[PDB]
Design a protein around this ligand. Sequence first.
Ligand code: 1QS
Ligand code: 1QS
Lengths: 472, 470
Amino acid sequence: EFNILLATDSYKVTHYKQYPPNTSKVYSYFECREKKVKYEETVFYGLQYILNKYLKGKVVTKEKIQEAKDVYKEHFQDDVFNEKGWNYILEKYDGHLPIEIKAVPEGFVIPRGNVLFTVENTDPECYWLTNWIETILVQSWYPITVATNSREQKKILAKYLLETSGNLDGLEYKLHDFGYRGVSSQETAGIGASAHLVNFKGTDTVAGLALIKKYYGTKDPVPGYSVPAAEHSTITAWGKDHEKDAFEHIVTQFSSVPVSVVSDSYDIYNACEKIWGEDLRHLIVSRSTQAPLIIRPDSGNPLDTVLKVLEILGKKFPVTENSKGYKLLPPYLRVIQGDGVDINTLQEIVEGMKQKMWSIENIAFGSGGGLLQKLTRDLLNCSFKCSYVVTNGLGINVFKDPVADPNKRSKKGRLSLHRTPAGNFVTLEEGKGDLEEYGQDLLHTVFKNGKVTKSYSFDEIRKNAQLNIELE
Amino acid sequence: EFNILLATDSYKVTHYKQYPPNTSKVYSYFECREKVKYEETVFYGLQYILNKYLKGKVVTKEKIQEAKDVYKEHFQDDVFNEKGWNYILEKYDGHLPIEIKAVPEGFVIPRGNVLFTVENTDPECYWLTNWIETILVQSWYPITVATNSREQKKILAKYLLETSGNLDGLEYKLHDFGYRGVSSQETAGIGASAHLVNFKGTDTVAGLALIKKYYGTKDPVPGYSVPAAEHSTITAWGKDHEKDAFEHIVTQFSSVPVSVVSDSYDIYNACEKIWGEDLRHLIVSRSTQAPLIIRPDSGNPLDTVLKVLEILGKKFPVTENSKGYKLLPPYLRVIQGDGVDINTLQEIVEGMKQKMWSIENIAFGSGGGLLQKLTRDLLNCSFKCSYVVTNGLGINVFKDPVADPNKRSKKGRLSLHRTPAGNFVTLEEGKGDLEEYGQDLLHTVFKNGKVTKSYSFDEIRKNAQLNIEL
Ligand SMILES: O=C(NCc1ccc(S(=O)(=O)c2cc(F)cc(F)c2)cc1)c1ccc2nccn2c1
Ligand SMILES: O=C(NCc1ccc(S(=O)(=O)c2cc(F)cc(F)c2)cc1)c1ccc2nccn2c1
C-alpha cells in the first residue's frame, strides 16, 4: 500500500531541521519556466489525478509512520526522520494533510513562465510539509508535457489538413496512441494515454480509459476508440509464401468495419502494388466508406515510404483531385504511418505530402515512444520553487537567482494569475494581486486540508484545451 | 484493481480471429535487437512483471465482464474474445496457460540474443502468447535503466582507477535524483531499482520497497542517502543570510556527511568567501566520515565543476595522491547533479583528468538523465513471433522488411548457448536440439500461473558486476 511518508526524495526527510527557526509558513509554486519546436504554451493537466490518488483523505497512519521510521533508520544509517511532525498530523487532523493547493483549471492553455499552481501549509507546525510533497506534485510534468506535445502535433495536423482539404474533418483521429509497450510502466501508460486523449480520440493504450473514468469522467461511455488491425505475427504466422492468404483472411473477417493491415512484413512495395493492388483489389474496391482498408507501412524512411506507398496506390486505384487541388485516394482506402513518428517527423511527412500534392485526408499517424515516452521534465522546464515564507510573524519574498544561469531565476513572493487588458496571461509577484488592478485570480483552491475542493470533468478539460482553429 | 484483460494494446483484442485456422501454438521471443554504443545489456525486471501482474488467478468473472463492457464501447462493436477468457477461468482457475523461459536476472548479454521466450501450453490459448506482449515488452525499461546505469559505472570505474589507483567508493559515485523527473510513482520504483543493480546511492525511495517485495537483499535496505539541503532551505533565510543558512545546516549535521547546494545566488562567491573564509573553521574541523559535500547546480557542468575545484583548492589544503592527481582534504567533497547524463558524465571526468583532479573528489547525481531520458529504441527491445504450429505442423516464421534489414526477426524455436570461446550465441530453427552447443542457458521462470524460478537482488548484483570489479 502507498505510503506518502516514503514518497519523497530522501534528502527532504532532513529538511525540517534546516529551515530558519520560527518559520510558520512555506509557500511554493509550480511553473513551466520560460527559457531564453518552441512550446510557448502548455496544457495544464493531471493534478486532479495526483490529488485524488495520493494526497486526499487519511494518508497518515500509525503503521505508516512506523514503517517510514524503520526504513529511514536503515536508509540513512541514522535517526533523522521527523516522527513528531508526522504524529502531529495524525493526531490533530486524523492523518489529513494540512495543505492548501490553488491551481489554474485543468485543460487551460497557459504561456510559459506563469504560475500554474501554488502550495502552502495551513498549520504553522507543518511548515516542512509544503516541500515534502514537491516530488509527488512535480510528476505532474508528465501529463502536462504529453498533453502539450500532443496538442502541438494537433496544430501541425490541423494546419496541413485545412490547407490540403479545406476543413478539419477527421482531425481528432489523425494521431493515434501506440505507446503502451513503449512506456516505462503500467501507471505511466494510463497517465500518458489520458493526456493524449485531451486532444485526440484514437488510442490503443487501454489503460487511459479507466484512469479517465475514475478520476475525471466523460458524458460518453468512453473517451477513446480503436478499430481492428493486424500485427506482424498475424501475418507472418501464415508463412512467408502466404502473405496474400493472411491479408485476404483478415479483410474478410473484418469486412464491415475499418481495418488496418501492416503490409511491410517482407516487401511493402510488392504488398501494395501486387497483393492489394492486383491480387486482392476486388476485396478492397467493394468496401464501404465507413469500413476502409487502412494500409500500414512500418519500416524505411517514414517520408520516403509514405510517398512511395501513395504513388503505388494512386496508380492501382482511382484517385480524385479535391477542390483544393490535392490528390485523394478512394474512400475505401487509406494509409497509417506508425513507425518513427514524433513531432518533428510528423511535420516532415505532412509537408512532404503537401509538396507532392497529396491531401492529408489520405493519412493518419500512430505514435508510441514519441508520444508517451520520449519526453522529459526539461522540455517545458516544469519546476517547483519556494517563493514566500513567514518567519517570526514576518512574510519574506524568497527566490533563487544563480549567477551563471538567469534562466533558472525563480519568482518572488505570493503569486497570482490574471488576464491582461489584451486578454493574455500575467503572473503577479510579491502579493501584488492583492492590489486588485488585474481582476480575479485565475488560480482556484483545488485541495485543502485533505479534501479535494474543486474538480473538472474530462469533457471540460477537452473544451479548455481546444485549438483556436477549432474555435474558429 | 489491475485487470490483465485491459492491459494490452487495443488491436490485440482482435487478433484471435486473424491467425491461421487450427493454430495450436504461438511461440514468441524478446531480444535487444542488434544494429557502436550499448553492445551488451543487463537483463533485469521480468521477475517484477511476473509477480505483480502475471501470476496466480488473474482472470475472474468480474474482470471478464468489465473487459467486455469496456471493449464494446471502445470498438463500438462486439469483438472481444469472451469465450477464450472464460475457458481460462473455467479450466485453469484463471491461471495463465503460458510458459516463459528467460536468462537469469542480472546477466550481461550482448545485443541480438534471445533474452526470454513465451508460448502457450494449451492449444486453445494460442492467442494468449501475443496478448501479453504489451505488458512483457515494458521490461525494456528496467533493462535499459540498468544497462545505461552500468555503462556509466564503467566510465566512472575507468577514470577513478586511473586517477586514484583503486575503485574505492565507486558504488556511491552516481546517485539517483530521478524521483520527480519520471512519469509516475510506479516508474520511479522500477527505475530506481534498476539503477541499484549497479550503485548503492539513491534518493528515489520507491525503489527500496520494490526490491524488498520482489527481489530481496540480505541487508535491511539496498540503497542509502545522507542529509542535504535544497534551494528552499537556503533561500528561505533571505538573500542576505545565505551564510546563516549554511552555518545552521552544517551545525545541525555536524557528525554525518551533509551536502549543501551552493549556487542559489553566486556559486563562486559561496565557495571562495562563504565556505572558503567565513565558515572555513566549521569545515576543517569535520570528520573524514562526515565531509561537507558542496553542490553546484547551474552553469556549464564541466566548466563549473572545474572552477569550483580550483576555488576550493586555493582555500583548502590540497594533496597529491600516489597517481599524481590533486585531492581535496577528506572533510570536503563535491557533487555535480545538474545536467548529468552518460555523455556529460564522460565529459566531466575526462575534463577533471586533464586538469589533474582525482575522481575521488567528486560524485554525480542524475535524475532525468538516469531514469527518464531513455526509450525502447535505445537497445531496440522487441517481442516477435518466431514459431507457430498450425494443423499439427511447426512453421518457422519471421519478418524481414525489404527496406530495413535491422528489423529482421529470428526464425523458429530459439535457445541460448555458450560458444567454444565462452561467448553467447542464440541458435535458431530449433538447432539447439542438435546438442552441438551444449545446454540451453534459458530457464523456465513462469509456467501455468506460477513463478518457477527467481533471483534475489544480491544475486542480480553479482551477475551484473563489471569485469574490472571481478
Ligand atoms: O493498428 C493498430 N491499432 C488499430 C488502429 C487501426 C486504425 C487506426 S486509424 O488511426 O486509422 C483509425 C482510428 C480510429 F479510432 C478509427 C478509424 F476509423 C481509424 C488506429 C489504430 C496498431 C498498430 C500498431 C501498434 N503498435 C502499438 C499499438 N498498435 C496499434
Ligand atoms: O543531495 C541530495 N541528496 C542527498 C545526497 C547527498 C550526498 C550524496 S553523495 O553521492 O555525495 C553521497 C551518497 C551517499 F550515500 C553517502 C555519502 F557519504 C555521499 C548523494 C545524495 C539531492 C540533491 C538534489 C536532488 N534532486 C533530486 C533529489 N536530490 C537529492
